[PDB]
């Protein structure tokens, strides 16, 4: 494609990483609070995933990966930044706060063109793999990726709901560890989460699982909404759903509906293991949305539940890079 | 006495509490982030070291600790920040930014007078109960009181000089706790000690062990030198020797000299139980530095290695009043 990046850290690095091997094209990064030397060791080397592997170097004003020449830019605040230098029409931002066209587009003056995002956002295009088809079109400078729990669960919908129909349905996400979590104990910031943490407590916390659903697949859009319950989990996360359905249900109907479909168009997402209670492993698996049938299935008519799944942290790097080229298609097309 | 404190957050909690039950009088604590309502839950509430007891609160813009009127201060900077302003005459730091006498006197800015902290300090007073002794009069406006490991260390040299005089020490530190150390893997900051962790992933580092020590008896600085290890380990602590020297032993003989003399000056410092190998309990055992003969022993005439036990939040604290209590009456007189 043609890329640069807003926080190595995290989604970044995959971003990088994934669009390199995963998708691809060439680049630049852009880091304010991680400078050169660490681009290397840093991306190369993480806890969660491991090493990297390629050659983790600096040469010529830059960072190379697998030669294919990349650099850094310090800057704080997008505009302040470059991004022209390179020509990275089509950015991803991972980030935190940058939330919203207007910081989104500000990047535009820096330079940028099209952007994508790391993030829900409340105002600004919204998006995911899973639903998106005809939705994201040119009209469109910038657009985003649902959170973790969210790209996860859109595809779920699918099979239940157009298959199902269904009507009243709430629920849960025990996740593993974001940046936000800290050791010990302490202060803590907005919407709280009590920051109280780490190793010691299985930690309550509520999201944005109603809207992002809906928005992604609205006819939902309002018979949804959720909260969870974080660990000392790194890397890699499940969920839990409940609903309510018009015709009928079967268990062995059900994770079918799924596995059918699941292995239909989706791919990139879906999944289902018949195999046998996985934990979390996964974690880099490759996988989208990915679900189970058995695990805590329980079944009756009209009221039932359902669990699938994660791998946050890399999963949603592969439909962001799923999307850029679907964006980039789209747009240049 | 009378005293204040830079940072809600561990140390401080009990810096308070301890203060509170332990030592007393009362106070008004330091912080632009944390607040009022917060307090009382904060302090109140470690799962780790546990809940209060008596009852944490906001009234008329100050918190009622056990009654005893109390206020905090918001103000980055201390300069900034009055002090006097609420009658805290005795003022500890609870950061790693000021220690030493340039923002330290500054506290005398806002208005202070005796300053005591939690860390070592090269420039200005340093200390430790053992050999604290004498050192501390009215001369000095400001004293530092050592590190976690530091104090626990410098009563290994006490016995181990006088003991067997000792030309020879080494260490090492199995540690635990610390903010800096982030979630999965990122920036840090400098120095490196990586916070490349938490659960998955130890990490090597090193501080405060030998060096130190010596003002707590220089005769010895020099024949020793120090670095550690840290688990995911969130409060207690364990610290390792090693020396070689004048003789006459078996481990049983040493444990026997701190034993005898652990009963005797020392008492709320030093210990000995047995009980085979113990463990990392002392989480709030209720003393400063603790050690035991067997836990782990190794031996070699002229050379032997030793263990010891230092529960930083917990312990640090009880030492600090220690010295609140000594200064305090030091200096009036
Ligand atoms: N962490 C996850 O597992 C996960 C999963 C899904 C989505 N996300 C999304 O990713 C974003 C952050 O997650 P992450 O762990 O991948 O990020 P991260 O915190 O590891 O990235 C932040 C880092 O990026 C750099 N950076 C770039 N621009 C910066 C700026 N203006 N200010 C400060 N630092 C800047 C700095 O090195 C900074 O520390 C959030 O939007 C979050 O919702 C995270
Ligand atoms: N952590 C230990 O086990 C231990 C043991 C002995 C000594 N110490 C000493 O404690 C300090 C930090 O360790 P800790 O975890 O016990 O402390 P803490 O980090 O975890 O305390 C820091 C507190 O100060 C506040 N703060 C932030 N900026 C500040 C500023 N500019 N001025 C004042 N307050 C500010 C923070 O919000 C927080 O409440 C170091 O000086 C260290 O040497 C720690």
Chains 1, 2 share one sequence.
Request: hydrophobic share 40%; net charge neutral.
């Amino acid at each position: 494609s043609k890329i640069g990046i807003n926080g190595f850290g995290r989604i970044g690095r995959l971003v990088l990483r994934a669009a390199l091997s995963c998708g691809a094209q060439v680049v630049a990064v852009n880091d304010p609070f991680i400078a050169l030397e660490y681009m290397v060791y840093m991306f190369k080397y993480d806890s969660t995933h491991g090493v990297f592997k390629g050659e983790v170097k600096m040469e010529d004003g830059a960072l190379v990966v697998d030669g294919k020449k990349i650099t850094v830019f310090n800057e704080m605040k997008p505009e302040n930044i470059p991004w022209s230098k390179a020509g990275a029409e089509y950015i991803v931002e991972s980030t935190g706060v940058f939330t919203t066209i207007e910081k989104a587009s500000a990047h535009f003056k820096g330079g940028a063109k099209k952007v994508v995002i790391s993030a829900p956002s409340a105002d600004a295009p919204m998006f995911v793999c899973g639903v998106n088809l005809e939705k994201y079109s040119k009209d469109m400078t910038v657009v985003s990726n649902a959170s973790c729990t969210t790209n996860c669960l859109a595809p779920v919908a699918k099979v239940l709901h157009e298959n199902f129909e269904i009507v009243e349905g709430l629920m849960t996400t025990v996740h593993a560890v974001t940046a936000t979590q800290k050791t010990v104990d302490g202060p803590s910031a907005k919407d709280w989460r009590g920051g109280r943490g780490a190793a010691q407590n299985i930690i309550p916390s509520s999201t944005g699982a109603a809207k992002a659903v809906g928005k992604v697949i609205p006819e939902l859009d309002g018979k949804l909404t959720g909260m969870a319950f974080r660990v000392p989990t790194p890397d890699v996360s499940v969920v839990d759903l409940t609903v309510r359905l018009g015709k009928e249900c079967s268990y062995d109907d059900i994770k079918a509906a799924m596995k059918t479909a699941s292995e239909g168009p989706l791919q990139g997402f879906l999944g289902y293991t018949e195999d046998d209670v996985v934990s979390s492993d996964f974690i880099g698996d490759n996988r989208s949305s990915i679900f189970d049938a058995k695990a805590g299935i329980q079944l009756s008519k009209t009221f039932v539940k359902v669990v699938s799944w994660y791998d946050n942290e890399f999963g949603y790097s592969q439909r962001v890079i799923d999307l850029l080229k679907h964006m980039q298609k789209v747009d240049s097309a």
